[model samples]
Target: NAMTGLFVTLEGPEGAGKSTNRDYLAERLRERGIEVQLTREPGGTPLAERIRELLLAPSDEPMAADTELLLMFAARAQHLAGVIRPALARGAVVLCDRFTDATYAYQGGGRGLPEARIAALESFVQGDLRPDLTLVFDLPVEIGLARGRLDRFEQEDRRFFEAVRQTYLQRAAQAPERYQVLDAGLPLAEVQAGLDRLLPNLLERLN
Candidate 1:
């Protein structure tokens, strides 16, 4: 329970550039001599990665909503035990690609699962652990779809993705202090600039 590290999560629909920005943030933190751990959801460990393949690979037999949610947490539990918790316990800055918020956005909003269910699972799995900062890359659904993907989530229609986007924005609006909503529709340089503006505050939080 003694977690001293800064936990930051980058969240957005596919092609919103979460991976690239995560790396950028890691580099920024590393330059300041901070210990940075860069990892992603559903696949941080070998066992969890197998779970990720189960979640992402498209199939003929439809997966139930409850199954999807549980599998997410299952993978997350392994990730936390094997990767996330140890890093945080050692006071490393953990910049993750996605976290529980994605479950809220994709499973709750897009898949129509209730938020209460996801909340229960989140508490059960993560306990009091939550991201110190969450950066949401916001963009139009069309832009995201055009950008790319053929995963199970990506195969969802426009409406589903729109729901995901709205959920992210709504959550960010509700928790402005913990969340930063970035205009990812802009060029890469502009988005990096937005992150740059946040660096001082991020460093301050670390201390």
Candidate 2:
């Protein structure tokens, strides 16, 4: 409704193909003359990337759910200050890989923490800053897990990843206005078609 830019985040489980979609969509956005910035949490900024290594470690030392959640926000807090907020302020369309929704899914839903706690942290990390759109790449836990096998995070058990997926859907249901859930389990062509359907309008919003 204004002449500002767009802030779009991608939310999904480990193997939901967020990276591929983000890359392809970014190319399209750039082709359309939309200024775009591509980045991801826990690794977008230097501080966040270091913390990401800590969080993703599959060594004998398992990280506590609380520790993981805190680290996530720590990275996000820095990311918002260092990367996301500034890009949006500069009138760029920010396409973020993941955000606080991952925390709600992984920590609150996956780890079984009190929802209130998750909400409070998000309230701070977000701090009146919210994406104009969030595309939740929805997929079955089983299939998503299978896809994970080819990646680093797949070293984690199906149970853990499923918990993450569960949280994602839960958060999606919770924030109806900000979300756009897609059938990620479908074929690539279909998924691209879904993006095609959504992007025109998303682009229009920024214009």
Candidate 3:
């Protein structure tokens, strides 16, 4: 895909308002006359959707750490081949709800998987493809827990989520240019204020 397209991903712990904020960004980008493809990871394609179910479904048997990591990348691989790649090739701005960074935060940080293992899988699956910009919705664990949406991963104890939060913060600090850390616990207006400033620059990158 030689066409200059943007890959923007939104990331956060569960209940961080990623869905609404992603929608907001998509709407704003579309308003600017850019072709926007709003989507999510782990379920963009049919095969990936099945994988998502397996990954998220509460199983009686505890899923192994490596297995969980493999499933995530399996869905990601299908998603890239089926949806993400084509959209980028056609010059569309692809706004995804979550991506590999979520893997690093959740698996590497929360589940205590080694960073080297995750890094290897990441390179094997994603290669040179990476998000152009990632907006991370950051909030205190209590604040996120207060939102009351408990998925399989979200049901983890406080310590797990705290590690997830720290991992994201560290990732953003390491690469400030590509990642934007938004205070998700703030008022809606404040979040939008940051977004307002971001949209124009995002558009500029592709143009």
**Predicted model with the maximum lDDT:** 1
Candidate 2 per-residue lDDT over residues 1-207, each given as its tens digit:
434668899998656678888988999899987789999987898888999888776666667777778888999998988988888777789999888777777677667788898878888777777788999998877644233223335565678778888777777788788898999999988898888898888888777
Query: Estimated TM-score per prediction?
Result: 0.93, 0.87, 0.93
RMSD of 2: 2.9
Residue-pair clashes per candidate: 0, 1, 0
Tell me the tens digit of each residue's lDDT in model 1 across 1-207.
Answer: 565888899898657777888888889899999999989987999999999999999999999999999999999999999998899888898888889999999999999999899999999999988899999988887734354357797678888988999999988988798998898899999899988999998988877
| Candidate 1 segments whose C-alpha is farther than 4 A from its true place | 1-3, 143-149
Which residue segments of model 3 deviate by more than 4 Å? 143-150
Error of 1 at 17 (Å): 3.0
Candidate 3, residue 77: Cα displacement in angstroms equals 0.4
List pairs with backbone clashes in candidate 2: 105-167
1 or 3, greater by lDDT: 1
